[PDB]
């Protein structure tokens, strides 16, 4: 009765983080920020390919590139919001961004170059977030669900890029 | 540089990465069986929607149509995943019922119609529960598709049972 | 009195939309409506199959048309079933024997040219079938005639849309 | 062949939509449009009466249909009045003698079966009435024919909807 | 009996909407579609001119009708060009000789009554032209017939709207 | 306690009509149906005028006529709904409709005729509904508010028609 | 002459909407608003319960009305709480003693006829309560009177809607 | 035919019928004084809206703008009625403040701005309460306008007082 | 093999969404669903009280969060009640004993800091309460688990939003 | 370091509270503010005049003018808002005081008796604003693009209002 | 000061054209009508290309053709509106339309033909409108802004067509 | 005549850039890319401040921080679109982003810190883009108008940030 309340009153400023939070909060925060860097890098890369993919066939890829780009930023916003709830700071610094990220920014010369670099990044993110989802287990459903939702989106991005690549050269 | 090499190996496989620990072949078979089930349930509900005329029946007819269209959304969801996992979705009407866990049943009465839909929903619920168990933690993206469909079928079952209890 | 218009309407009142003035062969029009319904359901399934399988840069353009066509087909299916019910029939959504009732076929195709060609064939079959139905109806059933005349126009668009693609292929 | 198309159009220019090529009997087409208009106004009033009076769980389903029908009837009224004006007539909205001009009646009914049955009778009267008008017009006035053909298709739907209800009652 | 339906469809398959059953004179139907297209383009330009020139209190009322008509005329143009393409023709948007191909003329007018009358004349020319076309088509080409029936009905509205204004002048 | 509920269960099928309803229900119902007849008549008269008022200036009146007609029907619906709540039957019968109504259906020959006839009807309704509002007093707020809302609308309809009539012949 | 209108406005300025001219008994009006607020909150909970429990074909129609009423009750609750704040009070949303404060009861009902009857009883209690409040206010507080007059008209509708259902039942 | 004769006499008076029992001339005077008040209050609120910058103040600034546009809606309501009753609405900025029950006051601080708006609302509340009493049952349509405006001013007064209590 | 899947579904058919394969303790899941329902109804009432009472410049920002939270609480209430029905229970909206059933309390608060603190305490009680329920369900009831996982995530947001405010206060 | 780019930033830190007004602002801030406020007064007067004409223009033909009057009135207020917004960005105070509003405004409030009066009075005001704002645009030159663009956008609207009113007046 | 108004009263019927209008109005009107013809011609050419560009790749260009066509008409409307404000008459006559225009109507046979002809026309318009913008200088801000808004639109159209042509 | 067409055909692949383009294309591209980097940096800084500014008062600034962030990205898109039209490549590389930009990414500790850094950045951009507008003169209206439109937005951002700082400093 009053013990339910006393548990909640202890360390109240910790907010979303309760007596029941069983995950390794600092390590989760580290992973959230690595993912955030990946999303920002993927956002900048896709935006680049979008502007550069001109032409008839390429304009189709350009549309997918832009759609992907803005989804990446949605993933970034989702992750930063969680970083804040779990007592961290989201790192939007462009300095060293690529070093924190699992993906690279690669301009590419051809369209096949562009698509391949995006496909490579998605497959890196897929396996990375699969590992994080496994690592979280049942200790942090709310964070686990963020990565599960991002994962499902990345799997779509991978298929969308691979579908294009098969038609190229 | 090995993360990049892991990703470059079998790049044409797309969403299916080295870390995909499920039996891709078996998941594809289950996805197509679900797809057939959803198309069959769509056709049955669409039949019942048109045939359920009257004062009281027209209320059931509305639910029939809502379910039919939800079934088609499930079909699209499953087919999309079949493609991401490197399969082919089988929309062939020939042998459609043999592939499906459900049946197409016209019914003579409205109680017939509701009962046949209720039976189909309960077949799907237990079938998809088993698939979700089979997937476990190997394919979250597919597991989440079936979990979302499952929740809908549970709604469809309650809606049909709620009606059936009021009938003759 | 003018009580004769009312007496006409009261006779066989449960027949609903079908009045004394309905001059068509109701049983046959219902047969044609159900054959048309089967054709649309098949065409819907074929187009959806092609939509999911047509991946790539060029093909994704075709896939969009395939999906647009698919849903137009189901709209036709709904129009026809609605009319079947108004004329006192039962619409047959049974997938068993669906192809046997249909003027069209379900064909997966291997290439994109295969998919486009098969859809073009189905449309040209439907166009000529529905022209024949429209003629059979004559002035006996304006409401049913108008459904097929409207579907016909959609099919001519689908045929032109698929042919326009096929000319650019291989 | 240019100045003769123009001279054709300049003659009786005040006739508006009604050109030399208008092969129908304008005076009679106007009579039929105004009878149709009275029928639609009457059917609107009857349905509105039934809408307000049909209370209860089961009745409210019919009442919803009564209202949809009522408002479709007024749409038909506007469509017909609009055409009357294009053909140089005057639409008669006068409530005095409205029923005598109409093919339908205003009938309150006591029961829901009464109300549904009376609406079903009126829809079936309109169907055959408008079928005859469509035949009378033939190819002489496509624009007026298409109005009646569009109204007819709606009346057939209204008849089916009322009959579908009556089967659950009688 | 199913392979012969398929054989009919394969013969001349590139002709698209035009099937073995198409019983109209395709070449002549196309000529009529192109004459109608010119009529609509001419009527569009004339109405647009009258719209801009019809200033004042009362005239602004006619000007609104002029603009609504102009844009309906272009919709008619679009319908006809779409049909020209389905039947294997070419829609002629060439401004050179546009008036010669058209049943109508471009006429500036000095007064508002000038403008309204010229528009009324054009609508009455189109009405009788399209009635003749609809008759020529008969039951041979429902899809084209329905286009002209739909355009005709709009032209009758335009004719009545212009005549209703002219009666006040 | 048990009397608040006992007052409400007694005569429960009388619905909105409670023990506290202090108005002369039968008379309120009579007035509601007379008002309903008036609105139906005014609806038909305005619709007649709307279709017949063609021309440059007349089309401006035609638009006001249509707005008025459709407001009249809203009033008809408002009143019929209230008749049902108070235990009556709304009379939509076209036979003898004018005999029940305070206003008349008048085709009019000229536009000034049409405007004048509408203005006369609005001023009849205004004075009728003011008397009903006074008659109701505080005995039936819900019904009173219906008439106060209709009255305000009729005052607008009257001002709109008089504004037109001042500019005429 | 402008300095006295301003001086009246400066006297007790923090009282806000409540001016020197407010002629009602602020304390008592606040009591009635809070009693009404409890009534609406209880009615919201009752209707919500009935909405979820009324399953079946015919019953689902009542469930739709139950939900609509439920949410209209909460709009009334908000309207009343908004006014309580303007008159310098505190709106009591405490679930403890909510029924003791409310003019209506929460009653689960066993049957649909039960549910409808209990809702119908509550509406008729509210009607007579709010009519009495409207009389008590007189011309002293138009802004509050208008809240109750608007709620009253809504309750008369809810009462009629429930009674219309009850007549068709058992 | 007597109802018709009543309506035909003085037909150009429009909404004002034989049964209009209010003092039309005096009602027009009050509508125009109220109109002036609303225009003045609109300008003052707009002034405060632009001048209330900062973290806290921007919250008040949003309220200032909302109030401002509501004031103009009232001006529109009042002018519409002035026309229906056969008058002329006075939008002249010369002497606008003399006709208005409220003042235009710039204020130096935010507390100044809030206090001045609160003073104006309480002036209008009591002014319109008096007008509603004067009308009684003689002019329902006009009475309802003032009753609707009055309720809005009470909200504005409560909203401003709610801000003032938190300030200084 | 088709008649055995079908026989499974006919056994206990009236149970609806609850199939032979449902491996949870339906009785207990329903108990927890109803305790959650009470918690959300109480949290809704508390937040609504705070919304209306939190006046002022800074406080109005909190008031907005209070209202957004309140309506999210009611959405949770509806989700939970819907599930109670599917599992064959009855959702308890009775205000009598509502607080005894709820894991949270209704607390008026005197200051804004009071209000924020009480809301924050409530969210943290809910967070840990629903985490325990998610554990209890395991893999036995995905559909119910997902409801709680979705609610949990919202409560974590509500906790962060209230704590973010409290850090700036007094 | 190497006070390079560090110079762009040191320019920005100086007088930071001056906000939009930077070291690069080459216009006479004091004078631009006077002009913005005169324009603001002009628009408020034009709004009140047009609103007056809207309510008084009853009749068949007049109601068409009444519609134009109302569209114009609300555009005038949009202009007033645009100008007041700029006054704040440049560190001024926008004067909404109705006392002396006309003395500050380039236009007049004129009731007019007839519709022809109303149309003419609005037409005169537009032509005053057109030439006033042309002069202001010229005075600004290239010193304040953001303020110039406000006046250029208002100017184009006033030219439309002028043409709209003249088109009506020709028929009277 | 009473002179501000007398300036505005002189030649009042000229409307937007005031004493301060320093441009050569007759010449501005000539340029506006030449631009109008250019837009009308470009509109017809684009529509022709839209209907004729069938196929997979071509349908992409066809969509751009239609967007451009309708933008061309928006420009035509902008220019005609300005002709009226400045006291001219807009010439929509199809006879001699091409002679008045800086562009041509060219059907083209291939898609490369169509795209090239559009690109050529856009570059003609760009340099024409740059010259007009220069001729206007500061004498007519309102007309100058119309051409600058169109110019930027034409630069987009040129880039869009060149982007397509590079792939052929 | 035939020379307008020949002028347009020369260097046709240059697209928007015609013979009449009198600006230094190479330099305009350099300036556009410096602005592009500035906007990307300002976007990241504002997003960081948005997530970190929690509390009652701080949430007001956070809302503005977010509105600014998204306006900055709109500016980035405008600038990149023009870079492509003038035949350049837009540089979205996070590597060296700050070195190319007139602005910096600065986390700040306090809200006063965040607001001040945003205010400084806007004032740098304001004066930088004013200079670019002068450099363009009348040689490139389309680009000048882009910067003139961005400038007006930056002036708003500066006023909005300064309005906040006055309440803090
Ligand atoms: Fe991705
Ligand atoms: Fe289902
Ligand atoms: Fe098709
Ligand atoms: Fe009808
Ligand atoms: Fe009907
Ligand atoms: Fe046409
Ligand atoms: Fe036309
Ligand atoms: Fe009226
Ligand atoms: Fe209620
Ligand atoms: Fe106020
Ligand atoms: Fe909750
Ligand atoms: Fe919560
Ligand atoms: Fe203006
Ligand atoms: Fe162009
Ligand atoms: Fe920027
Ligand atoms: Fe900025």
Author numbering:
A (entry chain J), F (entry chain H), L (entry chain G): 9 to 177
B (entry chain L), H (entry chain C): 10 to 177
C (entry chain I), D (entry chain E), G (entry chain D), I (entry chain K): 8 to 177
E (entry chain F): 8 to 176
J (entry chain B): 5 to 176
K (entry chain A): 9 to 176
Give verbatim excerpts from the published study on this entry.
We report the biochemical, structural, and functional characterization of the protein coded by gene PA4880 in the P. aeruginosa PAO1 genome. Unlike Dps, however, the ferroxidase di-iron centers and iron coordinating ligands are buried within each subunit, in a manner identical to that observed in the ferroxidase center of P. aeruginosa bacterioferritin.
X-ray diffraction from these crystals, followed by structure solution and refinement produced the model termed Pa DpsL-dd (2.9 Å resolution), which contains 12 molecules (a dodecamer) in the asymmetric unit, 33 sulfate ions and 24 Fe ions. Each of the subunits exhibit a Dps fold identical to that depicted in Figure 2A, except that the position of N-terminal residues D8–S30 is made evident in the 12-mer structure by well-defined electron density.
